[PDB]
């Protein structure tokens, strides 16, 4: 059934699984028309499909052309997500196909289950975790490739960079969720923390700065401080 704080370690066992987040698939700017009505303009989106054990990110870019002449776009977005995840699974060799797909939002369960009827052995599961995957478009290199796309495109990343050389996937996933939670709560403060010291750079083949183990502890500490403060502000406690 659902994924929560009790069966949390299952993410790092040796059964292939993917998280799917659909929160950046359909993205709009809202604006005033000349007649003073309101209109949306869609911008490029992405499906965030992540192996939490390996860090392999299958970033399917959703080009605004997919919405042309379509109605009920928020509903179509869920089915377009299911269609692309399905196509991704079918493109993978059998031994690479996931045994489970965990959707970050319950509204994806029926679209994905119907698109995956051909895969009765792949469990489609919701989660009770409030995962901050929506903040993926606050990672500069992911935001850049989405906004520059002129056509549908799949781009492959490792969202852990080289971390697994030094830490376990459990620790890698906890670091990722803390960075993304920070970026989601206060993007500017989070990004200032990450890039303050210009001697720590981002390798061309990475998403995050090349921190030493000691500098990660300091960074991780600063992200927790950011998150607790904003929480006190939000809730005046």
């Amino acid at each position: 059934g659902a994924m929560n704080s009790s069966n949390y370690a299952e993410l790092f066992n040796n059964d292939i699984k993917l998280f799917v987040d659909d929160t950046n698939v359909y993205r709009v700017t809202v604006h005033k028309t000349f007649e003073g009505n309101v209109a949306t303009k869609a911008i490029n989106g992405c499906i965030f499909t992540l192996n939490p054990k390996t860090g392999h990110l299958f970033l399917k870019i959703i080009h605004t052309s997919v919405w042309a002449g379509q109605k009920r776009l928020s509903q179509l977005a869920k089915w377009k997500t299911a269609e692309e995840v399905s196509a991704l699974v079918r493109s993978l060799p059998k031994e690479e196909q996931p045994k489970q797909i965990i959707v970050t939002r319950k509204a994806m369960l029926d679209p994905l289950e119907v698109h995956m009827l051909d895969f009765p052995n792949i469990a489609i599961r919701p989660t009770e975790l409030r995962l901050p995957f929506s903040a993926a478009m606050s990672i500069d290199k992911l935001s850049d490739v989405v906004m520059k796309a002129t056509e549908p495109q799949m781009v492959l990343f490792n969202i852990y960079d080289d971390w697994l050389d030094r830490i376990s996937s459990y620790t890698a996933f906890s670091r990722l969720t803390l960075l993304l939670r920070a970026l989601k709560t206060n993007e500017e403060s989070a990004k200032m923390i990450l890039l303050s010291d210009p001697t720590i750079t981002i390798k061309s083949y990475h998403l995050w700065p090349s921190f030493t183990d000691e500098q990660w502890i300091t960074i991780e500490s600063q992200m927790r401080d950011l998150i607790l403060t904003e929480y006190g502000r939000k809730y005046n406690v």
């Binding site: 179509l76 269609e83 029926d110 119907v114």
Partner: protein, 300 residues
């Protein structure tokens, strides 16, 4: 008019005949039911005074043979049986009628309730949902499971209803996933009506039979079947106008007949709210919507 004679009533029992019911006392001089209208399917049903669990009964059509009831003290139930000796049967019934030991099927002349509940129900189709081919009548009870229940275990004693599953390859065309899931017209019209049922009469027949098994026996799998068959029509954008008009009449009489106190267990909130308020057919079931709103406004 036909007669279902009884050998005797050795155990105290509530007897149902269609929508009617009578209390019979242990060893009461009861010899059965007369004046049964020819030309309809009938159900004769039983709840023992000592066991208000196991409602059970027999679907039958009087044109298909001479049927009687006899209590079996080994199996502990009222059994339907066929008498093949025509003269022996007429001779038994005439004696019991002369001695007035039979209750009369109590039809009011104005009253079309049973016809409206059984309009499309055909005894030949019932015998293919309940396969017991050595008998012309069909036994059903509270506990019998459906074929589809047995998938998710005795196949001979099961209800072989048409399997409906909205998240199935049968229901969903490859590459029409979203279209076919949000508009089930293709599953209704091509797969079910054209492919399996052949016509709307057989679809409505199984739907009406499922409802009656749910109401008379509290058969849970029958209730599931009745709701599935309603939900497939309400979830289809494209239904023939005559099917919607007839569906409205069918459901109206089912909701009218349902005991007021059984609405909590026999009616699925999600399906009815969908059919009446959310679905493509929200504006198409006027009679059904008026009676549901006036009789079970709580459920909605």
């Amino acid at each position: 008019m036909n007669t279902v004679p009884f050998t005797s009533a050795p155990i105290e029992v509530t007897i149902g005949i269609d929508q009617y019911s009578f209390n019979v006392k242990e060893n009461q001089p009861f010899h059965g039911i007369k004046d049964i209208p020819i030309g309809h399917v009938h159900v004769i049903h039983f709840q023992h005074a000592d066991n208000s669990s196991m409602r059970y009964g027999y679907w039958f059509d009087c044109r298909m043979g001479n049927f009687y009831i006899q209590y079996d003290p080994k199996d502990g139930l009222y059994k339907m049986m066929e008498e093949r000796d025509g003269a022996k049967f007429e001779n038994i019934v005439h004696n019991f009628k002369e001695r007035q030991m039979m209750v009369s099927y109590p039809k009011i002349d104005e009253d079309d309730t049973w016809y409206n509940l059984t309009e499309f129900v055909q005894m030949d189709k019932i015998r293919k949902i309940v396969r017991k081919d050595e008998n012309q009548f069909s036994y059903v009870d509270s506990s019998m499971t459906t074929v589809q229940e047995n998938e998710l275990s005795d196949p001979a004693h099961s209800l072989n209803y048409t399997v409906i599953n909205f998240k199935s390859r049968e229901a969903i065309r490859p590459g029409h996933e979203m279209e076919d899931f949000l508009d089930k017209s293709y599953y209704l019209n091509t797969v079910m009506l054209q492919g399996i049922f052949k016509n709307s009469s057989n679809y409505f027949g199984e739907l009406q039979f499922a409802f009656l098994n749910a109401m008379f026996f509290g058969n849970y799998g029958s209730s599931l079947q009745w709701h599935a068959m309603i939900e497939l029509i309400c979830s289809s954008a494209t239904v023939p106008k005559h099917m919607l008009d007839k569906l409205d009449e069918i459901l109206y009489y089912q909701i009218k007949t349902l005991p007021e106190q059984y609405s909590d267990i026999l009616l699925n909130e999600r399906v009815w709210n969908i059919c009446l308020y959310s679905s493509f057919q929200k504006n198409s079931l006027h009679n059904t919507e008026k009676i549901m709103e006036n009789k079970y406004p709580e459920l909605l």
